[PDB]
Design an enzyme around this catalytic site. Sequence first.
Site, mmCIF file in Angstrom:
data_model
loop_
_atom_site.group_PDB
_atom_site.id
_atom_site.type_symbol
_atom_site.label_atom_id
_atom_site.label_comp_id
_atom_site.label_asym_id
_atom_site.label_seq_id
_atom_site.Cartn_x
_atom_site.Cartn_y
_atom_site.Cartn_z
ATOM 1 C CB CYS A 214 31.336 126.252 7.137
ATOM 2 S SG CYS A 214 30.729 124.574 6.878
ATOM 3 C CB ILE A 218 28.468 119.318 5.428
ATOM 4 C CG1 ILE A 218 28.896 119.892 4.086
ATOM 5 C CG2 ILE A 218 26.960 119.321 5.492
ATOM 6 C CD1 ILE A 218 28.360 119.082 2.933
#
Length: 284
Positions: A214, A218
Amino acid sequence: EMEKEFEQIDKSGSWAAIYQDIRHEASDFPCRVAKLPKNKNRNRYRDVSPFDHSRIKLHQEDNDYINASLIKMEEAQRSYILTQGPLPNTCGHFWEMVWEQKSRGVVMLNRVMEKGSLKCAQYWPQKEEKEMIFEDTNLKLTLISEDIKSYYTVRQLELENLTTQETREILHFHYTTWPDFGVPESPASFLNFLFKVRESGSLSPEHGPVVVHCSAGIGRSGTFCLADTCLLLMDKRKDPSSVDIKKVLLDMRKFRMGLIATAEQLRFSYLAVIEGAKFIMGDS
């Protein structure tokens, strides 16, 4: 099944507390290499680093550093490499890693631009006539085709090692409708994307681990991975009750810090899992 615990936490409004205790209990291991002055520009977020024990090392004597962690789920027998969105200077590294680790798929759960800012470099070519060549890592990347859909796009890319002259098909699964730090409200869309990733074989043992990312690698990454492993464990045992999601998350957290960025993403994970359990339990 955990659907009860969900019913409880929800009706007790204890999600934030549940989540904070997971933080309180999460592993803490050194990230010394990440913090070296030389690797400063190789990290997107000063606060999000790979532990030295699980970081993926590049096969180069120059600088083997890349903000990437090998999440190895032993019990479930599934591995994932969670990583930050590559930076302008680290896209070659990213693809070198994809190559060396023998990855077959790349799951992107963010957009290049979010909330007015650049959360990831454009590390893949958007038009087949305009391929990318990573000089530093000596690899060429070409878009062969893409299938754009409502909330996600699957791309077929060819990664070529300009040295060995070897070639590999890399599938790029891009979830385009998932709010940064958010939840993709509707376990339906998420699960449909998850299963598309699965059906591709990208997640199979016969391939290197799937690279999931992303912006920080995380929050939304944690969610994807957490829901998948939980479903995998329920599958192996064909017993939804034997799965404790908090234990699963805490185990993923020994491999990379901060997985699941908000209490809602955690709450979402339960949702996706409890609902995906349906299918996994014979209701295909």
